[PDB]
Paper text:
Cytoplasmic dynein is a microtubule motor vital for cellular organization and division. It functions as a ~4 MDa complex containing its cofactor dynactin and a cargo-specific coiled-coil adaptor. The formation of dynein-dynactin-adaptor (DDA) complexes is a key regulatory step in dynein activation. Here, we determine the cryo-electron microscopy structure of dynein-dynactin on microtubules with LIS1 and the lysosomal adaptor JIP3.
Numbering used by the authors:
A (entry chain A): 3534 to 3824
B (entry chain A): 2566 to 3195
C (entry chain C), D (entry chain B): 89 to 297, 307 to 410
Amino acid sequence: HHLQQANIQFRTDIARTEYLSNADERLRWQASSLPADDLCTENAIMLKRFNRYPLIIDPSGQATEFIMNEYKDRKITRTSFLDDAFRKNLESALRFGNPLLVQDVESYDPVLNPVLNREVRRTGGRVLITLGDQDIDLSPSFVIFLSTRDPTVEFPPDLCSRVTFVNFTVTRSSLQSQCLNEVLKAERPDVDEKRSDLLKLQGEFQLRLRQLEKSLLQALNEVKGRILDDDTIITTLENLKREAAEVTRKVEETDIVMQEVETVSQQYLPLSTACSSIYFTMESLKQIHFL
Amino acid sequence: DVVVPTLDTVRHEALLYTWLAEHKPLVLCGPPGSGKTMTLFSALRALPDMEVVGLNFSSATTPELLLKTFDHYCEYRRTPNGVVLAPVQLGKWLVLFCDEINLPDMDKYGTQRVISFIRQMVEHGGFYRTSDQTWVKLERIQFVGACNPPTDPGRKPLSHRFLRHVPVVYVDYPGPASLTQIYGTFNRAMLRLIPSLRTYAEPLTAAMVEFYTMSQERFTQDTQPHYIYSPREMTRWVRGIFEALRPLETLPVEGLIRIWAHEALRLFQDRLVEDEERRWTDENIDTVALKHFPNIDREKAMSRPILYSNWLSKDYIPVDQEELRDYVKARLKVFYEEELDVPLVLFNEVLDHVLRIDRIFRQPQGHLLLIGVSGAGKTTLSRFVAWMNGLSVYQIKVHRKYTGEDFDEDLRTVLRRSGCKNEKIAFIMDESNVLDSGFLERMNTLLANGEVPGLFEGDEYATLMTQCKEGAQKEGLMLDSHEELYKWFTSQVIRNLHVVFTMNPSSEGLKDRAATSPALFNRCVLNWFGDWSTEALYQVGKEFTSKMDLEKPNYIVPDYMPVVYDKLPQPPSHREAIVNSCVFVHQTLHQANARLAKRGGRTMAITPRHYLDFINHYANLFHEKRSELE
Amino acid sequence: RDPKEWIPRPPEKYALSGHRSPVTRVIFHPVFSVMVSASEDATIKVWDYETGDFERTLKGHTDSVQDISFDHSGKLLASCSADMTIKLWDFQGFECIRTMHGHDHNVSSVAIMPNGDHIVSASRDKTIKMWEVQTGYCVKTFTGHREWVRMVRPNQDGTLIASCSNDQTVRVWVVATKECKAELREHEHVVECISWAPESSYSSISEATPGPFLLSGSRDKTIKMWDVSTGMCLMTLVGHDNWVRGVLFHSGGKFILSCADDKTLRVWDYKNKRCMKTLNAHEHFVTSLDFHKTAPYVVTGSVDQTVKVWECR
Amino acid sequence: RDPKEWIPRPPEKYALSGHRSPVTRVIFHPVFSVMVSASEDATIKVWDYETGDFERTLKGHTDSVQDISFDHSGKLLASCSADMTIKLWDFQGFECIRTMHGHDHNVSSVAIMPNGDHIVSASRDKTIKMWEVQTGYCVKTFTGHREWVRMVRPNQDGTLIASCSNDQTVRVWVVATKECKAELREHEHVVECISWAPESSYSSISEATPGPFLLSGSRDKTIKMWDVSTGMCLMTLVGHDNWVRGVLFHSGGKFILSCADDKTLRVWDYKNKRCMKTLNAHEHFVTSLDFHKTAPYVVTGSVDQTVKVWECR
Ligand SMILES: Nc1ncnc2c1ncn2[C@@H]1O[C@H](COP(=O)(O)OP(=O)(O)O)[C@@H](O)[C@H]1O
Ligand SMILES: Nc1ncnc2c1ncn2[C@@H]1O[C@H](COP(=O)(O)OP(=O)(O)O)[C@@H](O)[C@H]1O
């Protein structure tokens, strides 16, 4: 509203999640155990595009598994603040250039203050940071993540300045989708498994269509000659014909997906509405008697 | 030590000589900074038999502090009639000046341990050594005290059984008709290097009167807990003016009024919180210097920045903002290669703050007390100023399980590096570095006295004397014994150690700090940095977002025009409109934090580090999406 | 005129430009009419000061070249940079002969004593290293400073060296005995530049107050004279408005040529306790200067990437 | 030797390669020892010509660039391309500053007059546009050309703007008065390149056949020379066997180095009115050439994806 009142034009018909995240990165995030709701996608964007090292509040535990499945090739060492071998693990993470996930930041140690504040000495081309009493060669491929399990934690402003907060709260849409999925697992299992398989099929055919567009664009960007005189462009035409056949095939899968989701919607949508209402009563009931 | 005698000064001098000639206790009550330790130190200088031991009480005061004082300055001796406590200076009379008698905490059952302890050694003349439960009798020990009135917020009244053995004399502020000649003789001293300005000297002192009365009229202690005004500020005024025109040797009336206004703005505007009282003090400065100094060039004598630096030239000269800003850019370019490679942005308040920090850092016993939110660049500016003045910077490196012994060892290393090797040390520690009450008690003692009782004991005591005699023989002084060697070490610690304490503002935290620690509000100069205002946010936004491409030559200025940064130039460009929009984003989340808190949800601290995170994410997103589209 | 009465005068004879970074050190070749400068863009630019043009480029370093140095012959050069390297170049063929390693931090300054068989170096690791020019091995190691050593410089015969450091002390060591002969601690700020006294100045400082004598410029905006055999501050000259970056004796033994961060070049007479001449040198901080030992030429290298050459009159 | 007589010699000092397209224009930096090349792959490449090292690539234009122009400070770089955009580059920051729109066709040229305030732009739409640099607005417009305005250059004083077009005309205008001072119609073909005469050539032209003077090279295998004040062709060089693509004066004002489409880099003197040396530079069409004012180097940008640097001797 301030941008509209100040005559600064913005992309109105663009989702805030879709402008930042690519489709293949969204597919990789869906592969890394993340829920498909927009809030967890936004939080995945925050973890992707951090500038200050993030503090992740998570009352359910899904963000820890998402971070583990995200940086799985890069060996994340999982440690905690009250662990006895925490400073040695941090020193090994700084030396090795390893990603590091640290849990239980409610028991925060001030010794991580110069690493979080990025106070870094430049020994020429070498990079050295004084952690504690020891000067460690900081490899640039180091990240840290400060986990929290309890949602109702207050924080000092000295720690609050240096971190970017990421809250994995429970939305009505994600809860309704999870309850619909478990109701479909309990009641109509064949429809549930073929719906999951068809969703995977729709995702990989959309990936194949994007691969078509990228490959054809980069092929025609460097033909460096006549397309008609080159017979390789006829093979590009055959590739176009095959992927047009697959994008025509995708409509039948879309129709079967539509029939399945309308059947399960008219079957079990008020049930999921009751799920959302009862769990929001669960979350709001702490306002009565504190216990 | 320069005390010019007034009526109340000599009356209380005769009173204190009467109370102190009989080795009788006395309590100098009154408002803080009214000269109660001036009058006491004038009474002690009349009789050379009496030697002073300074002690400063806190809210968390224990008689173990007096036990450490007796361990240092006195000895236990065996006599046939008991065990006696006597000063190591035989024939002299030791007097213990406790600074904050009303301050130790009154318990749930209506008592104070230190007050009852002092009453026990005054009514009965001795105490109980708890090492073997033996009655020690004081041989040559008397007590004097100073306190604020008990009607002050941070002070508590004393027991009747304690004041049954002590008289109280109540000093007051000298008032305007005494301060006019008190600082008239000071200005008649100080305007002797310049023989032409003395015809303006006597109204100028008179000028320094009236502002102070409005400083006592509006800025009450109910407004802010650090709103106390004492003749120490006028002493700071005259020594700042004296150190201003000390090396200059040429100045007209306009420069004198400029120096007076600059000292007044550095002494009466830094302690203020909001900009309303800052505007009121600047308006008071304008009307007072117009009233007492007519027919003078108001444009030449008074301008906007009024900054005084000695970085560009060796003399304390008035300088413009732009040359100072360019020198600060070049010095940051030098400084990034030496201590810390953390980039710094500037605005006008950044230059003003680093001039305040350098101005307090230049003097010996320069202690800073910074008030500001976390992430506002409080310690980075102090690091830059301390590097530029050639001061080594020390942080305590706080980790988990930081007891008092590690802090005592850190303070031992700081004092040995400062007072023995004569190395200038800027001692930096945060409000989160305070974990125990002993931390604040030892910091209060170090800030007030410049020495800690019982910090060095056993073999480290003799190690301190060997290091101090080696440092004195390196310096050139032929020293001996332990008492005068400790005096020389204390003088070196006073000269070389600069302590900066930084917190965040709070409605209850600062109110409790004003009671639990006097020396942070009595011996430290307060600088209220505060949160970044809209002008600072617009300057950092417009100064980082000038490199990228933002300009629309066809831009329609909207008629609605939501303005949150004042003095937005019309017709604004696209960059000005979107920098004002960024300022609006920060302001509306400032409003949203209170909107979330008033519903019942827990709020989280908004910092300028978040704004520097938001503006840095602008250029990273703009350069990515522009290179994506191309 | 005579070599006694050379004084620089405005304006400059030449204003050479071309560096991508602030110029850090400029000196003269002793035999041929060659001038050489270095900067923070990892390059060494060789010019001809008599004709005022570009001659050669030497690109071997990776980081900011802090200081370069000559020998008694002028055929050999040593340079140091921030990559913990020391590069030993020649002059007759313009190639990098050796690359010594071993320093922990930024090698700030190098110098060669006039015997030419050895090379001294100062660095940020609070050590001074002493390398063999025939083997490229640090043979000796002076240690005892408390902070970063700014630059080191040896005396005329190679028996004494002096180092100004970030501990606000100036330490004069003996080469053979490896012990700090004089520890001069009267400066308050960091001492950034030092200089030795020539033979013809040996009487003249005694006129102002044998030896050995030593100049020292610090960040406290003062230039101090020291006697090693006494150990006291012989005189102090004030008048520089900012941090002094380069201090050098005149070849006549009577003037003091100095530069600071006030964009000025100052010529002092220490007999009259004053700066006789002040010249506007650059727009930014004048990092280094040099006086030519026989011809009337003064070179000034500065932050703003221009090297100014002044003809002395 | 002096910079006066400098003629390049085979072979090339360096053969820079890495462009994915023909090279359209190459220019030297005025003060630094680096050169910038423009090519049809919309990549503005920066190469160090002293060591032959590739430095950087600026990619802001979304179509093929034609002409690049520095300023005499070396801080701002003006670049034109066929995307209806002009781009201003901070050379010290290596990022774009502003993008200019308003041309409806291929912006075939861009230049900065020596007053350091505006930008010339010749384009395919038969007009020339004036651009304000700091604000970013199109101010003035030369109109009167009837064909493709090939390339434009302002005079050394900043009061004359000369442009060649495809209608066999060389049109010299005054900057603000908007009149065609000289509509020279003597060339038989499209004039593709002009070169403003330096001051030292002003005598040398005047005794070959005062001022101001102007060069031009066309597709009729001829390079004509014109007096601006009179308005006629004084002299003509013939001897190229194809289209002359770039014509360039010597910095000393005697020789003219010119590249033509017959794989020839020929040097011409107006005293003899012939070609003394012809160099076979590349293996394809040679588009542009450039010669340094103080350095003995000629850079040559050609279609064959290589940029060749040749030492002048
Ligand atoms: N007549 C006077 N002569 C000299 N100084 C005075 C006079 N009256 C007040 N002062 C100044 O007032 C200040 C009061 O400070 P101080 O006595 O230290 O406060 P406190 O007694 O609360 O510790 C002194 O620093 C002193 O310089
Ligand atoms: N004016 C500023 N310009 C650039 N960075 C700043 C500025 N102020 C604060 N910062 C950032 O804040 C961080 C340190 O904050 P700090 O000074 O510790 O805040 P505080 O002292 O209030 O705890 C640094 O990493 C620095 O990048």
